[PDB]
Design a protein around this ligand. Structure first.
Ligand SMILES: CNC(=O)c1ccc(Nc2ncc3cc(C(=O)N(C)C)n(C4CCCC4)c3n2)nc1
Length: 262
């Protein structure tokens, strides 16, 4: 099937350690998509060539309105090409840069869409999506799309590196090197809810080593404007003990979510 020759290429939307994402157009249909190009040299150098094969097969069978779809893939001698759904409105991170912070209705609606997406993932035994806001995209109707597949990429407008944003969202159990389970995704939801309402991630620090300590000790505080319902949900999700974190269905039914979400 697919070859590079089937596509018109436009500007790079972003770049990462492993390659770039281009605006592209399939020549026959004129359908616009995102062509993610990963360099085999970089994949081999990092030893992730086997991970990508595994994740491609997984992504192929993920179909959810709030997960970016993989349409197909191909390769040549030097590159792996992932044919991805194009999400026209950019990242949630950039929309946070523009708005500074989100109101409770927007936040609760987004958390609802992500919790649904993650519940679908867990049903497939797919866990630990990196749902930092740079990996969350906005479809043409403004729906959220989980898009961490194929590793991070940064748009030119970004001020946060690949590494830093991923670190901001790591749960204590992976910082500490312990076993983890699907509760890592509940932790990420709590970090995201906070960054949405506040405009900054809760464990942000000047150095990576300080960030590690803040995550491990769950050292976060709320600005005055965070409402008591938002504080309750975020506090339940950011528990050090994964067993203490709610079920995704309990997030979806939380009174602050149901009062504010679209
Ligand atoms: C001023 N305008 C814009 O910043 C803008 C940026 C992207 C955009 N669409 C899009 N569609 C599908 C994407 C899959 C990826 C990807 O591999 N990620 C790991 C997330 N990304 C990246 C590329 C760079 C930012 C997100 C995708 N980005 N539409 C508009």
């Amino acid at each position: 099937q697919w070859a590079l020759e089937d596509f018109e290429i436009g500007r790079p939307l972003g770049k990462g350690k492993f390659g770039n994402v281009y605006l592209a157009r399939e020549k026959q249909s004129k359908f616009i998509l995102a062509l993610k190009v990963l360099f085999k040299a970089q994949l081999e150098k990092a030893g992730v060539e086997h991970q990508l094969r595994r994740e491609v097969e997984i992504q192929s069978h993920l179909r959810h309105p709030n997960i970016l779809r993989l349409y197909g893939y191909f390769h040549d001698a030097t590159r792996v090409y992932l044919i991805l759904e194009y999400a026209p409105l950019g990242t949630v991170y950039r929309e946070l840069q523009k708005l500074s912070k989100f109101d409770e209705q927007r936040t609760a609606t987004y958390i609802t869409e992500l919790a649904n997406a993650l519940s679908y993932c867990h049903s497939k035994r797919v866990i630990h999506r990196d749902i930092k806001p740079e990996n969350l995209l906005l479809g043409s109707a403004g729906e959220l799309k989980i898009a961490d597949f194929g590793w991070s990429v940064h748009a030119p407008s970004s001020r946060r590196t690949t590494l830093a944003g991923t670190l901001d969202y790591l749960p204590p159990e992976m910082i500490e090197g312990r076993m983890h389970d699907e509760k890592v995704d509940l932790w990420s939801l709590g970090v995201l809810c906070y960054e949405f309402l506040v405009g900054k991630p809760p464990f942000e620090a000047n150095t990576y080593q300080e960030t590690y300590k803040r995550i491990s000790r769950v050292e976060f505080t709320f600005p005055d404007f965070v409402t008591e319902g938002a504080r309750d949900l975020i506090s339940r999700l950011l528990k050090h003990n994964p067993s203490q974190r709610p079920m995704l269905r309990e997030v979806l039914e939380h009174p602050w979510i149901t009062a504010n979400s679209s």
